Each structure stands twice: as C-alpha cells, then as structure tokens.
C-alpha cells in the first residue's frame, strides 16, 4: 500500500544501447536465425508493481513477453528464445537478480537503476552483455 523498494524500476523503458548481446546469446545456445532477428530488436520494457507481485513486460517486433513474480519465489518461464527455464528473482542491495536454470545450465540477468537509466547485465559463463534502457 505504501512505497515499494522496486518502485524505482517502475515505468516504461526503451532500449538505447547494447554491447556483446550476440556473444551472450551464443553462450546461452540461441540458434543463428533467432540471434539475428532478436539482436535487431529494440524492445520496450514495462515494469509495474502491485502489492508483492512485480510484472516485467518486454514488447518488441521480435516477441512480446511478460513475467510476473514474487521476490524469492521460483517460477516457470518460457524465454523469448523458447527456453523452458526455472527462474528466481531476488533483490540484492537495490539490484534485481534474475537466475534462470535449464538443462544443467544457468544464466543471471541483473537489472539496476543507474542515473536515469535502467541497466541490464546478462551473464553466461564469463560472457557479459550490457543493455541500457532509458525512460520512454
Ligand atoms: C530483450 C527482448 C528482445 C531480444 C530477445 C532475446 C532472445 C534470446 C535471449 C533471451 C535473453 C533475454 C535477455 C534480456 C535482455 C533485455 O531485456 O534487454
């Protein structure tokens, strides 16, 4: 009912820069055609909070996806590249930390506020991709 910690994430955000995303997708195991088309996308990310439930939507020409979750509570996620993963998202000192597990593999996506930006760091096996979003 009062202000939530994650309120700083709430809003509509647009992708403005990406680094190393193709390499990150390769490490995750994303196939050629999906990497090419997904790498071209300039998504909007819409984040909202309602009680304990955080919703993150990604809208792009490639795919529209949405996840809703409670911090610390594992859920099923079908990713944009059609991985069926088990996901858990927590808040660690202001940073949303999203761990995806599938097929004995794991990747971590961190989302944080930096100045007026929302910075998304995707990490797989030593490869990091940084994606920067600004308010739409
Ligand atoms: C981010 C949506 C468009 C690109 C879809 C990428 C599909 C393959 C990789 C899935 C990992 C998703 C990484 C999230 C990064 C982000 O939201 O910008």
Short mmCIF file of N, CA and C and ligand atoms in Angstrom, two decimals:
data_model
loop_
_atom_site.label_atom_id
_atom_site.label_comp_id
_atom_site.label_asym_id
_atom_site.label_seq_id
_atom_site.Cartn_x
_atom_site.Cartn_y
_atom_site.Cartn_z
N UNK A 1 0.84 -1.24 0.00
CA UNK A 1 0.00 0.00 0.00
C UNK A 1 0.86 1.27 0.00
N UNK A 2 1.95 1.27 0.77
CA UNK A 2 2.95 2.35 0.72
C UNK A 2 3.98 2.11 -0.37
N UNK A 3 4.98 2.99 -0.45
CA UNK A 3 6.06 2.86 -1.46
C UNK A 3 6.83 1.55 -1.33
N UNK A 4 7.11 0.93 -2.48
CA UNK A 4 7.85 -0.32 -2.58
C UNK A 4 9.29 0.03 -2.98
N UNK A 5 10.22 -0.84 -2.61
CA UNK A 5 11.62 -0.61 -2.94
C UNK A 5 11.82 -0.60 -4.46
N UNK A 6 11.12 -1.52 -5.14
CA UNK A 6 11.21 -1.67 -6.58
C UNK A 6 10.51 -0.56 -7.35
N UNK A 7 9.91 0.40 -6.65
CA UNK A 7 9.22 1.49 -7.35
C UNK A 7 10.12 2.28 -8.29
N UNK A 8 11.42 2.32 -8.00
CA UNK A 8 12.38 3.00 -8.88
C UNK A 8 12.52 2.32 -10.25
N UNK A 9 12.10 1.06 -10.34
CA UNK A 9 12.13 0.32 -11.60
C UNK A 9 10.86 0.54 -12.43
N UNK A 10 9.82 1.03 -11.78
CA UNK A 10 8.51 1.08 -12.40
C UNK A 10 8.44 2.10 -13.52
N UNK A 11 7.82 1.72 -14.63
CA UNK A 11 7.71 2.63 -15.75
C UNK A 11 7.88 1.96 -17.09
N UNK A 12 7.97 2.78 -18.13
CA UNK A 12 8.16 2.31 -19.49
C UNK A 12 9.53 2.75 -19.96
N UNK A 13 10.30 1.80 -20.46
CA UNK A 13 11.71 1.98 -20.74
C UNK A 13 11.95 1.54 -22.16
N UNK A 14 12.88 2.20 -22.84
CA UNK A 14 13.23 1.81 -24.21
C UNK A 14 14.73 1.52 -24.34
N UNK A 15 15.06 0.48 -25.09
CA UNK A 15 16.46 0.08 -25.26
C UNK A 15 17.20 1.15 -26.05
N UNK A 16 18.31 1.65 -25.52
CA UNK A 16 19.11 2.64 -26.25
C UNK A 16 20.52 2.19 -26.64
N UNK A 17 21.05 1.18 -25.95
CA UNK A 17 22.34 0.63 -26.34
C UNK A 17 22.49 -0.82 -25.91
N UNK A 18 23.29 -1.56 -26.67
CA UNK A 18 23.54 -2.97 -26.41
C UNK A 18 24.99 -3.25 -26.75
N UNK A 19 25.64 -4.05 -25.91
CA UNK A 19 27.01 -4.47 -26.16
C UNK A 19 27.09 -5.95 -25.87
N UNK A 20 27.66 -6.70 -26.82
CA UNK A 20 28.00 -8.11 -26.63
C UNK A 20 26.80 -9.04 -26.52
N UNK A 21 25.63 -8.56 -26.93
CA UNK A 21 24.42 -9.38 -26.82
C UNK A 21 24.45 -10.60 -27.72
N UNK A 22 25.01 -10.48 -28.93
CA UNK A 22 25.12 -11.65 -29.81
C UNK A 22 25.97 -12.73 -29.15
N UNK A 23 27.12 -12.33 -28.60
CA UNK A 23 28.01 -13.24 -27.88
C UNK A 23 27.33 -13.88 -26.66
N UNK A 24 26.55 -13.08 -25.92
CA UNK A 24 25.78 -13.62 -24.80
C UNK A 24 24.78 -14.67 -25.31
N UNK A 25 24.04 -14.33 -26.36
CA UNK A 25 23.10 -15.28 -26.92
C UNK A 25 23.76 -16.57 -27.42
N UNK A 26 24.94 -16.45 -28.01
CA UNK A 26 25.70 -17.64 -28.43
C UNK A 26 25.99 -18.54 -27.24
N UNK A 27 26.43 -17.94 -26.13
CA UNK A 27 26.82 -18.71 -24.95
C UNK A 27 25.59 -19.41 -24.36
N UNK A 28 24.44 -18.73 -24.42
CA UNK A 28 23.19 -19.31 -23.93
C UNK A 28 22.77 -20.49 -24.81
N UNK A 29 23.17 -20.45 -26.08
CA UNK A 29 22.83 -21.51 -27.03
C UNK A 29 21.77 -21.16 -28.06
N UNK A 30 21.49 -19.86 -28.19
CA UNK A 30 20.49 -19.39 -29.14
C UNK A 30 20.98 -19.63 -30.56
N UNK A 31 20.10 -20.20 -31.39
CA UNK A 31 20.42 -20.51 -32.79
C UNK A 31 20.61 -19.28 -33.65
N UNK A 32 21.23 -19.48 -34.82
CA UNK A 32 21.56 -18.38 -35.75
C UNK A 32 20.39 -17.43 -36.06
N UNK A 33 19.29 -17.98 -36.56
CA UNK A 33 18.22 -17.12 -37.06
C UNK A 33 17.62 -16.30 -35.92
N UNK A 34 17.36 -16.95 -34.79
CA UNK A 34 16.88 -16.22 -33.60
C UNK A 34 17.86 -15.14 -33.14
N UNK A 35 19.15 -15.43 -33.13
CA UNK A 35 20.13 -14.42 -32.70
C UNK A 35 20.07 -13.20 -33.60
N UNK A 36 19.94 -13.44 -34.90
CA UNK A 36 19.95 -12.33 -35.87
C UNK A 36 18.72 -11.45 -35.69
N UNK A 37 17.56 -12.08 -35.57
CA UNK A 37 16.31 -11.32 -35.50
C UNK A 37 16.14 -10.71 -34.11
N UNK A 38 16.48 -11.47 -33.08
CA UNK A 38 16.41 -10.95 -31.70
C UNK A 38 17.42 -9.84 -31.45
N UNK A 39 18.58 -9.93 -32.09
CA UNK A 39 19.63 -8.93 -31.91
C UNK A 39 19.25 -7.60 -32.54
N UNK A 40 18.34 -7.63 -33.52
CA UNK A 40 17.91 -6.41 -34.20
C UNK A 40 16.88 -5.65 -33.36
N UNK A 41 16.27 -6.35 -32.41
CA UNK A 41 15.13 -5.78 -31.70
C UNK A 41 15.54 -4.64 -30.79
N UNK A 42 14.64 -3.67 -30.68
CA UNK A 42 14.81 -2.52 -29.81
C UNK A 42 13.61 -2.50 -28.88
N UNK A 43 13.61 -3.40 -27.88
CA UNK A 43 12.39 -3.55 -27.09
C UNK A 43 12.06 -2.39 -26.18
N UNK A 44 10.78 -2.31 -25.82
CA UNK A 44 10.37 -1.55 -24.65
C UNK A 44 10.17 -2.50 -23.49
N UNK A 45 10.56 -2.05 -22.31
CA UNK A 45 10.35 -2.84 -21.12
C UNK A 45 9.43 -2.05 -20.23
N UNK A 46 8.36 -2.70 -19.79
CA UNK A 46 7.36 -2.07 -18.95
C UNK A 46 7.35 -2.82 -17.64
N UNK A 47 7.64 -2.09 -16.56
CA UNK A 47 7.76 -2.70 -15.24
C UNK A 47 6.71 -2.09 -14.32
N UNK A 48 5.99 -2.95 -13.61
CA UNK A 48 4.96 -2.48 -12.70
C UNK A 48 4.96 -3.34 -11.43
N UNK A 49 4.44 -2.77 -10.35
CA UNK A 49 4.40 -3.44 -9.06
C UNK A 49 2.99 -3.30 -8.53
N UNK A 50 2.47 -4.41 -8.01
CA UNK A 50 1.13 -4.41 -7.43
C UNK A 50 1.21 -5.33 -6.23
N UNK A 51 1.28 -4.74 -5.04
CA UNK A 51 1.49 -5.50 -3.81
C UNK A 51 2.87 -6.13 -3.85
N UNK A 52 2.91 -7.45 -3.70
CA UNK A 52 4.14 -8.21 -3.72
C UNK A 52 4.50 -8.71 -5.12
N UNK A 53 3.63 -8.46 -6.10
CA UNK A 53 3.81 -9.01 -7.45
C UNK A 53 4.45 -7.96 -8.37
N UNK A 54 5.60 -8.32 -8.91
CA UNK A 54 6.31 -7.48 -9.88
C UNK A 54 6.05 -8.08 -11.25
N UNK A 55 5.72 -7.24 -12.23
CA UNK A 55 5.50 -7.67 -13.61
C UNK A 55 6.49 -6.95 -14.50
N UNK A 56 7.18 -7.73 -15.32
CA UNK A 56 8.10 -7.18 -16.32
C UNK A 56 7.61 -7.65 -17.70
N UNK A 57 7.20 -6.69 -18.53
CA UNK A 57 6.84 -6.97 -19.92
C UNK A 57 7.95 -6.48 -20.85
N UNK A 58 8.25 -7.26 -21.88
CA UNK A 58 9.14 -6.83 -22.96
C UNK A 58 8.35 -6.86 -24.25
N UNK A 59 8.20 -5.70 -24.89
CA UNK A 59 7.50 -5.64 -26.19
C UNK A 59 8.48 -5.28 -27.28
N UNK A 60 8.51 -6.10 -28.33
CA UNK A 60 9.36 -5.78 -29.48
C UNK A 60 8.78 -6.38 -30.74
N UNK A 61 9.39 -6.07 -31.88
CA UNK A 61 8.95 -6.62 -33.16
C UNK A 61 9.22 -8.12 -33.20
N UNK A 62 10.17 -8.56 -32.38
CA UNK A 62 10.55 -9.97 -32.31
C UNK A 62 9.52 -10.78 -31.53
N UNK A 63 9.22 -10.33 -30.31
CA UNK A 63 8.29 -11.06 -29.46
C UNK A 63 7.79 -10.15 -28.36
N UNK A 64 6.60 -10.44 -27.88
CA UNK A 64 6.11 -9.80 -26.66
C UNK A 64 6.11 -10.83 -25.56
N UNK A 65 6.81 -10.55 -24.47
CA UNK A 65 6.85 -11.50 -23.34
C UNK A 65 6.47 -10.79 -22.06
N UNK A 66 6.07 -11.58 -21.07
CA UNK A 66 5.71 -10.99 -19.79
C UNK A 66 5.97 -12.03 -18.71
N UNK A 67 6.53 -11.57 -17.60
CA UNK A 67 6.67 -12.40 -16.40
C UNK A 67 6.11 -11.64 -15.22
N UNK A 68 5.42 -12.36 -14.34
CA UNK A 68 5.02 -11.84 -13.05
C UNK A 68 5.54 -12.78 -11.98
N UNK A 69 5.99 -12.20 -10.87
CA UNK A 69 6.69 -12.99 -9.86
C UNK A 69 6.70 -12.29 -8.52
N UNK A 70 6.99 -13.08 -7.49
CA UNK A 70 7.20 -12.58 -6.14
C UNK A 70 8.67 -12.82 -5.84
N UNK A 71 9.32 -11.84 -5.21
CA UNK A 71 10.74 -11.96 -4.91
C UNK A 71 11.03 -13.21 -4.10
N UNK A 72 12.05 -13.95 -4.51
CA UNK A 72 12.49 -15.14 -3.79
C UNK A 72 11.74 -16.41 -4.09
N UNK A 73 10.69 -16.32 -4.92
CA UNK A 73 9.80 -17.46 -5.18
C UNK A 73 9.94 -17.94 -6.62
N UNK A 74 10.45 -19.17 -6.76
CA UNK A 74 10.74 -19.76 -8.07
C UNK A 74 9.48 -19.83 -8.94
N UNK A 75 9.67 -19.61 -10.23
CA UNK A 75 8.59 -19.71 -11.21
C UNK A 75 9.09 -20.29 -12.54
N UNK A 76 8.13 -20.74 -13.35
CA UNK A 76 8.37 -21.20 -14.71
C UNK A 76 8.38 -20.05 -15.66
N UNK A 77 9.38 -20.03 -16.53
CA UNK A 77 9.49 -19.00 -17.53
C UNK A 77 9.78 -19.68 -18.86
N UNK A 78 9.05 -19.28 -19.88
CA UNK A 78 9.41 -19.62 -21.26
C UNK A 78 10.04 -18.34 -21.83
N UNK A 79 11.33 -18.40 -22.14
CA UNK A 79 12.05 -17.20 -22.59
C UNK A 79 11.72 -16.84 -24.05
N UNK A 80 12.14 -15.65 -24.47
CA UNK A 80 11.88 -15.16 -25.83
C UNK A 80 12.45 -16.09 -26.91
N UNK A 81 13.55 -16.77 -26.58
CA UNK A 81 14.19 -17.74 -27.48
C UNK A 81 13.67 -19.17 -27.29
N UNK A 82 12.60 -19.29 -26.51
CA UNK A 82 11.87 -20.56 -26.31
C UNK A 82 12.60 -21.60 -25.45
N UNK A 83 13.43 -21.12 -24.52
CA UNK A 83 13.92 -21.97 -23.45
C UNK A 83 12.83 -22.09 -22.40
N UNK A 84 12.69 -23.28 -21.84
CA UNK A 84 11.78 -23.50 -20.70
C UNK A 84 12.68 -23.54 -19.47
N UNK A 85 12.64 -22.47 -18.68
CA UNK A 85 13.58 -22.31 -17.56
C UNK A 85 12.87 -22.20 -16.20
N UNK A 86 13.60 -22.50 -15.14
CA UNK A 86 13.12 -22.25 -13.79
C UNK A 86 13.82 -20.98 -13.35
N UNK A 87 13.03 -19.98 -12.96
CA UNK A 87 13.56 -18.65 -12.64
C UNK A 87 13.32 -18.24 -11.21
N UNK A 88 14.28 -17.53 -10.61
CA UNK A 88 14.08 -16.95 -9.30
C UNK A 88 14.66 -15.56 -9.35
N UNK A 89 13.90 -14.59 -8.87
CA UNK A 89 14.35 -13.20 -8.88
C UNK A 89 14.33 -12.69 -7.46
N UNK A 90 15.45 -12.10 -7.05
CA UNK A 90 15.59 -11.50 -5.73
C UNK A 90 16.09 -10.07 -5.85
N UNK A 91 15.99 -9.33 -4.76
CA UNK A 91 16.58 -8.01 -4.69
C UNK A 91 17.82 -8.07 -3.84
N UNK A 92 18.96 -7.69 -4.41
CA UNK A 92 20.20 -7.68 -3.65
C UNK A 92 20.74 -6.27 -3.63
N UNK A 93 20.67 -5.62 -2.48
CA UNK A 93 21.07 -4.21 -2.37
C UNK A 93 20.66 -3.35 -3.55
N UNK A 94 19.37 -3.34 -3.83
CA UNK A 94 18.83 -2.46 -4.88
C UNK A 94 18.83 -3.03 -6.29
N UNK A 95 19.51 -4.17 -6.49
CA UNK A 95 19.61 -4.78 -7.81
C UNK A 95 18.67 -5.98 -7.91
N UNK A 96 17.86 -6.03 -8.97
CA UNK A 96 17.05 -7.22 -9.23
C UNK A 96 17.96 -8.26 -9.88
N UNK A 97 18.07 -9.42 -9.23
CA UNK A 97 18.94 -10.51 -9.68
C UNK A 97 18.05 -11.67 -10.11
N UNK A 98 18.12 -12.01 -11.40
CA UNK A 98 17.24 -13.00 -12.04
C UNK A 98 18.10 -14.17 -12.50
N UNK A 99 17.90 -15.34 -11.89
CA UNK A 99 18.66 -16.52 -12.24
C UNK A 99 17.72 -17.45 -12.99
N UNK A 100 18.17 -17.92 -14.16
CA UNK A 100 17.43 -18.89 -14.99
C UNK A 100 18.22 -20.20 -15.04
N UNK A 101 17.54 -21.31 -14.74
CA UNK A 101 18.14 -22.64 -14.77
C UNK A 101 17.42 -23.49 -15.81
N UNK A 102 18.19 -24.19 -16.65
CA UNK A 102 17.60 -25.14 -17.59
C UNK A 102 18.70 -26.07 -18.08
N UNK A 103 18.38 -27.35 -18.23
CA UNK A 103 19.30 -28.32 -18.87
C UNK A 103 20.70 -28.32 -18.24
N UNK A 104 20.75 -28.18 -16.91
CA UNK A 104 22.02 -28.14 -16.18
C UNK A 104 22.84 -26.89 -16.42
N UNK A 105 22.23 -25.89 -17.06
CA UNK A 105 22.87 -24.60 -17.33
C UNK A 105 22.21 -23.51 -16.49
N UNK A 106 22.91 -22.39 -16.36
CA UNK A 106 22.43 -21.27 -15.57
C UNK A 106 22.91 -19.96 -16.18
N UNK A 107 22.04 -18.95 -16.13
CA UNK A 107 22.41 -17.59 -16.53
C UNK A 107 21.77 -16.60 -15.57
N UNK A 108 22.40 -15.44 -15.42
CA UNK A 108 21.95 -14.43 -14.48
C UNK A 108 21.76 -13.13 -15.24
N UNK A 109 20.61 -12.50 -14.99
CA UNK A 109 20.30 -11.20 -15.55
C UNK A 109 20.12 -10.24 -14.39
N UNK A 110 20.93 -9.18 -14.36
CA UNK A 110 20.82 -8.19 -13.28
C UNK A 110 20.23 -6.91 -13.85
N UNK A 111 19.30 -6.31 -13.11
CA UNK A 111 18.65 -5.08 -13.56
C UNK A 111 18.86 -4.06 -12.45
N UNK A 112 19.38 -2.90 -12.80
CA UNK A 112 19.61 -1.88 -11.77
C UNK A 112 19.38 -0.48 -12.31
N UNK A 113 19.00 0.41 -11.42
CA UNK A 113 18.91 1.83 -11.76
C UNK A 113 20.28 2.49 -11.64
N UNK A 114 20.68 3.18 -12.70
CA UNK A 114 21.94 3.94 -12.72
C UNK A 114 21.63 5.27 -13.34
N UNK A 115 21.73 6.34 -12.55
CA UNK A 115 21.29 7.66 -13.01
C UNK A 115 19.84 7.55 -13.50
N UNK A 116 19.51 8.06 -14.68
CA UNK A 116 18.14 7.98 -15.18
C UNK A 116 17.90 6.75 -16.04
N UNK A 117 18.88 5.85 -16.04
CA UNK A 117 18.84 4.66 -16.89
C UNK A 117 18.48 3.42 -16.11
N UNK A 118 18.02 2.40 -16.82
CA UNK A 118 17.87 1.07 -16.26
C UNK A 118 18.88 0.22 -17.05
N UNK A 119 19.84 -0.35 -16.33
CA UNK A 119 20.94 -1.09 -16.94
C UNK A 119 20.69 -2.58 -16.70
N UNK A 120 20.76 -3.37 -17.78
CA UNK A 120 20.52 -4.81 -17.71
C UNK A 120 21.82 -5.51 -18.09
N UNK A 121 22.36 -6.30 -17.17
CA UNK A 121 23.62 -7.04 -17.38
C UNK A 121 23.28 -8.53 -17.45
N UNK A 122 23.56 -9.16 -18.59
CA UNK A 122 23.25 -10.57 -18.80
C UNK A 122 24.55 -11.34 -18.80
N UNK A 123 24.65 -12.34 -17.93
CA UNK A 123 25.92 -13.06 -17.76
C UNK A 123 25.73 -14.56 -17.97
N UNK A 124 26.58 -15.13 -18.82
CA UNK A 124 26.55 -16.58 -19.05
C UNK A 124 28.02 -16.96 -19.12
N UNK A 125 28.48 -17.83 -18.22
CA UNK A 125 29.80 -18.47 -18.40
C UNK A 125 30.94 -17.52 -18.84
N UNK A 126 31.08 -16.39 -18.16
CA UNK A 126 32.18 -15.47 -18.42
C UNK A 126 31.91 -14.40 -19.47
N UNK A 127 30.86 -14.60 -20.26
CA UNK A 127 30.39 -13.62 -21.24
C UNK A 127 29.32 -12.73 -20.62
N UNK A 128 29.53 -11.42 -20.70
CA UNK A 128 28.58 -10.43 -20.18
C UNK A 128 28.09 -9.54 -21.32
N UNK A 129 26.78 -9.28 -21.35
CA UNK A 129 26.21 -8.29 -22.28
C UNK A 129 25.55 -7.20 -21.46
N UNK A 130 25.76 -5.95 -21.85
CA UNK A 130 25.19 -4.83 -21.13
C UNK A 130 24.20 -4.14 -22.04
N UNK A 131 22.98 -3.97 -21.55
CA UNK A 131 21.92 -3.32 -22.31
C UNK A 131 21.37 -2.18 -21.50
N UNK A 132 21.31 -1.01 -22.13
CA UNK A 132 20.92 0.19 -21.43
C UNK A 132 19.58 0.66 -21.92
N UNK A 133 18.69 0.91 -20.96
CA UNK A 133 17.36 1.42 -21.24
C UNK A 133 17.19 2.83 -20.65
N UNK A 134 16.47 3.68 -21.37
CA UNK A 134 16.08 5.00 -20.86
C UNK A 134 14.55 5.11 -20.80
N UNK A 135 14.04 6.08 -20.05
CA UNK A 135 12.59 6.25 -19.93
C UNK A 135 11.97 6.53 -21.29
N UNK A 136 10.87 5.86 -21.61
CA UNK A 136 10.26 6.02 -22.93
C UNK A 136 9.43 7.29 -23.02
C1 LIG B 1 15.02 -8.47 -24.87
C2 LIG B 1 13.92 -8.91 -25.82
C3 LIG B 1 14.39 -8.90 -27.28
C4 LIG B 1 15.54 -9.88 -27.51
C5 LIG B 1 15.14 -11.31 -27.18
C6 LIG B 1 16.38 -12.16 -26.94
C7 LIG B 1 16.03 -13.64 -27.06
C8 LIG B 1 17.21 -14.55 -26.70
C9 LIG B 1 17.89 -14.28 -25.36
C10 LIG B 1 16.97 -14.23 -24.14
C11 LIG B 1 17.66 -13.41 -23.04
C12 LIG B 1 16.88 -12.17 -22.63
C13 LIG B 1 17.84 -11.08 -22.13
C14 LIG B 1 17.12 -9.85 -21.58
C15 LIG B 1 17.80 -8.57 -22.06
C16 LIG B 1 16.83 -7.42 -22.28
O1 LIG B 1 15.66 -7.43 -21.83
O2 LIG B 1 17.18 -6.42 -22.95
#
